[PDB]
Amino acid sequence: DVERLLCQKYPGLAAELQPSGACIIRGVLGSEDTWRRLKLYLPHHPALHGFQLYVQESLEYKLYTSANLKLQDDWLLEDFLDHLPKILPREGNIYYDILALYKSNEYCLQVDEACSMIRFSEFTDFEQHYLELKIPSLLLLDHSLPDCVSLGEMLTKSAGNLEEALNLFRKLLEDLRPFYDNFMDIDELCHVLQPSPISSKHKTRLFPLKDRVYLKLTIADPFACIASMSLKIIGPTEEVARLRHVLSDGLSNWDSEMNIHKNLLRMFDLCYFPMPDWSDGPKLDEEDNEELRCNICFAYRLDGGEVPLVSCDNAKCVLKCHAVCLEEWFKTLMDGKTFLEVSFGQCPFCKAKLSTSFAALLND
Ligand SMILES: OC[C@H]1O[C@H](O[C@H]2[C@H](O)[C@@H](O)[C@@H](O)O[C@@H]2CO)[C@H](O)[C@@H](O)[C@@H]1O
Ligand SMILES: [Au+]
Ligand SMILES: [Au+]
Ligand SMILES: [Au+]
Ligand SMILES: [Au+]
Ligand SMILES: [Au+]
Ligand SMILES: [Au+]
Ligand SMILES: [Au+]
Ligand SMILES: [Au+]
Ligand SMILES: [Zn+2]
Numbered sequence: 001d002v003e004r005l006l007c008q009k010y011p012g013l014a015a016e017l018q019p020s021g022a023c024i025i026r027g028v029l030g031s032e033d034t035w036r037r038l039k040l041y042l043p044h045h046p047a048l049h050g051f052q053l054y055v056q057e058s059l060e061y062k063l064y065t066s067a068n069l070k071l072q073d074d075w076l077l078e079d080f081l082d083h084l085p086k087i088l089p090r091e092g093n094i095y096y097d098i099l100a101l102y103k104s105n106e107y108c109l110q111v112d113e114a115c116s117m118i119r120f121s122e123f124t125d126f127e128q129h130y131l132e133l134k135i136p137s138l139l140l141l142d143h144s145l146p147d148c149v150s151l152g153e154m155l156t157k158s159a160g161n162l163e164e165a166l167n168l169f170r171k172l173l174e175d176l177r178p179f180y181d182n183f184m185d186i187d188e189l190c191h192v193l194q195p196s197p198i199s200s201k202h203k204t205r206l207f208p209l210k211d212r213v214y215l216k217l218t219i220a221d222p223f224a225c226i227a228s229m230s231l232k233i234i235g236p237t238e239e240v241a242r243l244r245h246v247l248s249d250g251l252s253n254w255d256s257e258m259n260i261h262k263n264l265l266r267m268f269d270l271c272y273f274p275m276p277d278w279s280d281g282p283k284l285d286e287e288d289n290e291e292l293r294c295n296i297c298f299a300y301r302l303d304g305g306e307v308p309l310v311s312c313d314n315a316k317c318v319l320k321c322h323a324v325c326l327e328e329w330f331k332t333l334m335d336g337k338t339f340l341e342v343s344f345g346q347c348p349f350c351k352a353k354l355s356t357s358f359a360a361l362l363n364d
């Protein structure tokens with residue numbers, strides 16, 4: 001309807017309606033030699049009067065009402081938009097600054113040819129982390145840290161010179177040690193199945209709790225490590241059902257003076273998590289049916305390191321599956337309604353109960 005006109009003529013605007021018969025348009029409107037950040041309130045869409053335009057003049061938003069700004073008596077939204085852009089009214093040296101930072105025991109600083117970009121790395125106590133900026137922009141290129149962090153935004157607003165940038169970054173690193181430290185133990189003492197290749201960026205970890213039962217740890221806010229912590233039990237219906245109670249209790253009894261790993265051991269009454277060990281002897285014995293490969297894709301490991309973990313309650317149904325290879329089945333089954341309303345579906349193979357706890361492997 002209106003996002004139509006917004007799509008063809010204004011790709012940088014987002015028209016959000018309200019059930020309150022109103023309409024808010026935010027986004028960017030542009031002319032050939034200028035653009036503005038914009039927020040337009042329209043109390044009476046499609047009538048313009050009573051309009052409330054917020055244009056970012058610099059640091060703050062400037063407000064335009066009918067008193068502020070004068071429209072035409074006949075204009076519609078379109079008219080108002082393609083008209084709007086015309087009606088609205090020591091410095092130190094960076095190369096020196098690089099040389100200033102070049103030598104240091106706390107990080108190696110690398111300069112690209114033509115010095116178009118620089119890269120900090122091998123940070124002390126965070127040797128895995130790195131930061132790349134454009135020169136002399138100081139525009140954020142690549143970097144470690146979960147992608148959900150608004151580092152770019154932080155830099156532009158809070159970092160004036162190269163040194164200020166470096167430090168803002170090392171600041172977050174310190175802020176992030178609890179997040180990182182916490183995954184330290186889980187990575188070394190648990191058998192982490194996904195992410196296949198673990199990186200400074202991943203806010204997640206999936207590992208086995210016991211035979212047939214996986215536990216997926218996920219940390220929404222890397223700065224609010226435990227506040228944003230979240231556990232999900234994945235496995236056969238009854239195991240899931242059973243363990244879900246343990247989980248609740250475990251959280252209620254959370255020992256704040258213990259990290260997540262040890263707190264999980266506490267939670268599930270284990271002195272250690274299941275993990276491959278030389279003491280398992282040589283496998284061979286058992287020779288799990290040669291087919292551990294999905295069973296739909298006929299692949300074992302996907303381009304993203306996904307692995308066949310899905311399995312019905314029926315011990316006798318040899319047959320596993322990548323969650324994504326079954327993504328629709330999981331959504332066409334439990335569409336909307338929560339998984340306690342829908343615990344399972346039918347094993348498309350033996351018909352057995354198939355826990356919908358696996359849908360948890362989706363999305364991410
Ligand atoms: O007798 C089995 C085994 O128990 C312990 O080994 C554990 C190990 O501590 C963990 O990594 C766990 O995930 O699996 C291993 C095998 O059960 C003992 O430490 C080990 O010496 C012993 O053989
Ligand atoms: Au568009
Ligand atoms: Au709208
Ligand atoms: Au140098
Ligand atoms: Au280096
Ligand atoms: Au984030
Ligand atoms: Au934590
Ligand atoms: Au033990
Ligand atoms: Au359907
Ligand atoms: Zn698959």
Ligand SMILES: [Zn+2]
Nearest residue numbers: 317347349350
């Ligand atoms: Zn089955």
